[PDB]
Amino acid sequence: SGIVPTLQNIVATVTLGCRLDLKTVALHARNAEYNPKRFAAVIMRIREPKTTALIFASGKMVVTGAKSEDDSKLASRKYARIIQKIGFAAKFTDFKIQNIVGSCDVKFPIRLEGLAFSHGTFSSYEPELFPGLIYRMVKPKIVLLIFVSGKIVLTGAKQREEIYQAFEAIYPVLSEFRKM
DNA sequence: GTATATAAAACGGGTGGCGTTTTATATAC
């Protein structure tokens, strides 16, 4: 082994606590998009940490694109400050990470059909529909996308340890189904 | 486009329970 998964995307939610006028928000922000007809939220962005926020009239906000939990909270506080600077009585509350995505490379090809047959109740593999095997782990409850190349995607985690836990648990199985 | 996780909530549609839609990301067909 020796491989440890790399975090790729962190999704979080934040309650600003006050109602927002989206045209005002979009108008005053330096990096905003807002087309009511397409989606009901201002799509705001900041350069550091590089992230994207979906800002709603209710004052709720979704922050995505961060590569670390630190970066997620940091960028979230920053978006909240922007809203304040524009003039609303916003508050940075209820910061919570909802989804963590990770990925790695085991460095060997995998026999997906064998794995799907062996771990049938957790696996779903339809190569004509999507080339990767969808593995639904029980403990921890994580979803893994397994590819012939040996590249692995882990998602559905609320905490970093779950990403790490799942990979540790899957590695022996990937080894059992290697090609070379 | 296909598939995976996840929140936010307005829209469409017919006056309603709920599917779609958007955003970010790895991955590969």
Side-chain angles (χ1 to χ4, degrees):
Chain A
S1 206
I3 313 103
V4 191
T6 313
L7 301 192
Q8 302 296 340
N9 181 43
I10 306 238
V11 178
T13 47
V14 179
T15 299
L16 295 179
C18 72
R19 272 251 147 196
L20 310 181
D21 189 274
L22 299 189
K23 295 283 179 182
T24 302
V25 172
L27 178 62
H28 294 283
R30 305 178 192 179
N31 202 334
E33 281 192 65
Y34 179 54
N35 318 279
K37 286 164 174 36
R38 195 203 169 173
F39 195 60
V42 172
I43 300 170
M44 193 183 294
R45 298 187 168 79
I46 61 173
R47 297 170 188 157
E48 231 105 81
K50 193 204 154 135
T51 40
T52 296
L54 301 178
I55 304 171
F56 299 81
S58 60
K60 292 292 185 72
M61 167 174 87
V62 171
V63 184
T64 186
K67 302 249 166 196
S68 79
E69 305 97 321
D70 161 310
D71 278 353
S72 189
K73 181 167 73 82
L74 226 211
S76 295
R77 296 173 180 283
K78 289 180 178 175
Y79 283 111
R81 190 51 185 170
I82 294 172
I83 298 312
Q84 292 176 338
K85 194 188 138 169
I86 293 174
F88 301 94
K91 189 185 178 181
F92 173 69
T93 44
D94 301 333
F95 176 75
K96 174 182 169 180
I97 283 163
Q98 305 285 179
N99 187 38
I100 298 178
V101 186
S103 71
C104 56
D105 194 346
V106 296
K107 301 291 185 60
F108 52 85
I110 307 173
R111 285 141 46 220
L112 302 183
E113 187 45 61
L115 176 22
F117 176 71
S118 172
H119 291 230
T121 40
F122 311 122
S123 298
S124 171
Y125 181 49
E126 294 160 63
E128 235 58 41
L129 180 68
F130 180 67
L133 185 146
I134 298 150
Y135 196 109
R136 300 192 193 255
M137 198 165 275
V138 179
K139 218 290 139 188
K141 191 166 184 291
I142 291 306
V143 177
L144 307 88
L145 311 194
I146 300 160
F147 303 87
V148 173
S149 59
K151 299 284 212 298
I152 308 298
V153 174
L154 307 96
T155 191
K158 284 282 198 259
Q159 260 87 215
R160 170 181 298 225
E161 288 182 296
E162 305 169 336
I163 295 288
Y164 291 170
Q165 251 136 47
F167 185 60
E168 284 177 55
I170 203 73
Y171 197 87
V173 188
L174 302 179
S175 256
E176 185 197 352
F177 293 98
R178 66 157 71 77
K179 307 228 259 185
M180 337 97 57

